[PDB]
Amino acid sequence: EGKLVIWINGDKGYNGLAEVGKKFEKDTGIKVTVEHPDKLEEKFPQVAATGDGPDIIFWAHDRFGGYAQSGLLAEITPDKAFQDKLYPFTWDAVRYNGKLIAYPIAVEALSLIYNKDLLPNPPKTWEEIPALDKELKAKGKSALMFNLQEPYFTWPLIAADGGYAFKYENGKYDIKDVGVDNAGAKAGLTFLVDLIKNKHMNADTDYSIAEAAFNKGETAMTINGPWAWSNIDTSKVNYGVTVLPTFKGQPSKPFVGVLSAGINAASPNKELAKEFLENYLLTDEGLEAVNKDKPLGAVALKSYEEELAKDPRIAATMENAQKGEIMPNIPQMSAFWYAVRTAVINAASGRQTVDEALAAAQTNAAANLEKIKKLRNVITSAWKVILYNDDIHNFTYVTDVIVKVVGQISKAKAHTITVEAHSTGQALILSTWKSKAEKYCQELQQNGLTVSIIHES
Numbered sequence: 001e002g003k004l005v006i007w008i009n010g011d012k013g014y015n016g017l018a019e020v021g022k023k024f025e026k027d028t029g030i031k032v033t034v035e036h037p038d039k040l041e042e043k044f045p046q047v048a049a050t051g052d053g054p055d056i057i058f059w060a061h062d063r064f065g066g067y068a069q070s071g072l073l074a075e076i077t078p079d080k081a082f083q084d085k086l087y088p089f090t091w092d093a094v095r096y097n098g099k100l101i102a103y104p105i106a107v108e109a110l111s112l113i114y115n116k117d118l119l120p121n122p123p124k125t126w127e128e129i130p131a132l133d134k135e136l137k138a139k140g141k142s143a144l145m146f147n148l149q150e151p152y153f154t155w156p157l158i159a160a161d162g163g164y165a166f167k168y169e170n171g172k173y174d175i176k177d178v179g180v181d182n183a184g185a186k187a188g189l190t191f192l193v194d195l196i197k198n199k200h201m202n203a204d205t206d207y208s209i210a211e212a213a214f215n216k217g218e219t220a221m222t223i224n225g226p227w228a229w230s231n232i233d234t235s236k237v238n239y240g241v242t243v244l245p246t247f248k249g250q251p252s253k254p255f256v257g258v259l260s261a262g263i264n265a266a267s268p269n270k271e272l273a274k275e276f277l278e279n280y281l282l283t284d285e286g287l288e289a290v291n292k293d294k295p296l297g298a299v300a301l302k303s304y305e306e307e308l309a310k311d312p313r314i315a316a317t318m319e320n321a322q323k324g325e326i327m328p329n330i331p332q333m334s335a336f337w338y339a340v341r342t343a344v345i346n347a348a349s350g351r352q353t354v355d356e357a358l359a360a361a362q363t364n365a366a367a368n369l370e371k372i373k374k375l376r377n378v379i380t381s382a383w384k385v386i387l388y389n390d391d392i393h394n395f396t397y398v399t400d401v402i403v404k405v406v407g408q409i410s411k412a413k414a415h416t417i418t419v420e421a422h423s424t425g426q427a428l429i430l431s432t433w434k435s436k437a438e439k440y441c442q443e444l445q446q447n448g449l450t451v452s453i454i455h456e457s
Contacts, residue, residue, distance in 0.1 A: 065329025142425030
């Protein structure tokens with residue numbers, strides 16, 4: 001070789017990229033073939049110690065710091081003029097030991113997504129959301145549903161007033177300086193936990209419930225990323241995508257994720273890779289070819305982003321991303337994620353105080369990396385029918401319908417579901433197999449109830 005072999009994830013525009021590679025071969029005579037291997041973030045280092053993986057790899061910047069600690073990635077050498085063409089902060093995302101480790105391609109971050117018919121003017125503050133919800137709850141809906149179960153989604157609030165993962169000392173992260181337990185994070189997590197105590201959100205609320213509920217027009221807001229826009233498009237919801245709400249006057253700080261192209265260390269074709277990435281792919285024509293196949297979202301290349309940001313959805317993605325934290329690339333992050341996943345789950349449930357959940361998370365986040373992975377392990381029926389809030393105040397009727405339709409359910413259980421749905425916005429009725437869930441949802445709906453059917457799994 002001779003040639004260029006590129007590995008890119010399957011949910012990305014892998015046919016557009018090939019069209020870039022087609023132009024490359026037309027100009028240079030070097031054949032570039034694109035491939036999309038299942039589990040390539042895993043399939044890569046099992047094929048990269050032996051030496052024969054791909055020349056260039058696309059994935060996400062947070063996993064590239066540990067790729068570099070394994071010396072498995074070549075140091076890219078862009079020049080002044082070239083670096084200046086991409087947003088400065090995107091370069092910070094691809095860096096380990098004072099040294100650039102990959103090329104930034106796309107930029108993603110959570111935004112506040114809202115339903116324009118339910119809520120023509122989205123709130124500028126988190127603080128005003130409790131009242132918002134009280135109002136909507138009376139109109140048979142709810143204000144907000146997003147994924148409470150995962151730290152990636154709850155962190156934008158927890159970090160707003162001062163939370164951080166690990167302190168940055170230039171080039172190196174300090175895994176002994178964790179920012180999960182300072183005054184800011186306590187304030188954020190207390191707000192979130194109070195949202196749940198005051199019944200404004202159901203504590204069980206996950207990605208699937210939130211997507212269904214927002215897309216059905218049952219909740220006025222949700223928090224998600226560009227990857228989710230397609231599904232709302234399909235649905236009948238006129239939606240907006242805006243800046244995330246402030247908390248204590250400070251912007252939310254979502255984690256930033258950079259789609260990144262790194263060059264393999266055991267590749268003879270390093271200079272050809274550089275030429276491809278810098279001169280063919282990271283150009284307006286080049287990103288446009290990939291994006292025309294399957295949208296990239298916001299991009300690291302200024303010239304094309306300025307064009308794309310004519311879309312306020314993409315403008316909002318970058319405004320939120322610029323207000324966020326670059327997701328640390330080091331592998332200690334695995335401990336951080338466990339620490340904050342566990343604190344939120346425990347604080348929001350009542351098993352711990354906010355202050356003790358975070359006190360423990362500060363130690364767990366900085367803790368020995370193996371001791372923490374050992375811990376994770378120390379701790380059909382896949383279709384769920386979900387009951388939504390509505391204007392039916394006759395709980396007796398609703399309780400009875402659930403009892404009639406669902407075989408298992410007692411009257412008391414049926415009633416408690418009814419109360420939980422109307423109180424929090426949503427409640428689980430049952431989880432069985434696709435056939436049963438469909439019969440039941442269909443039946444519950446015919447009786448005037450407002451239901452979703454959900455998979456997850």
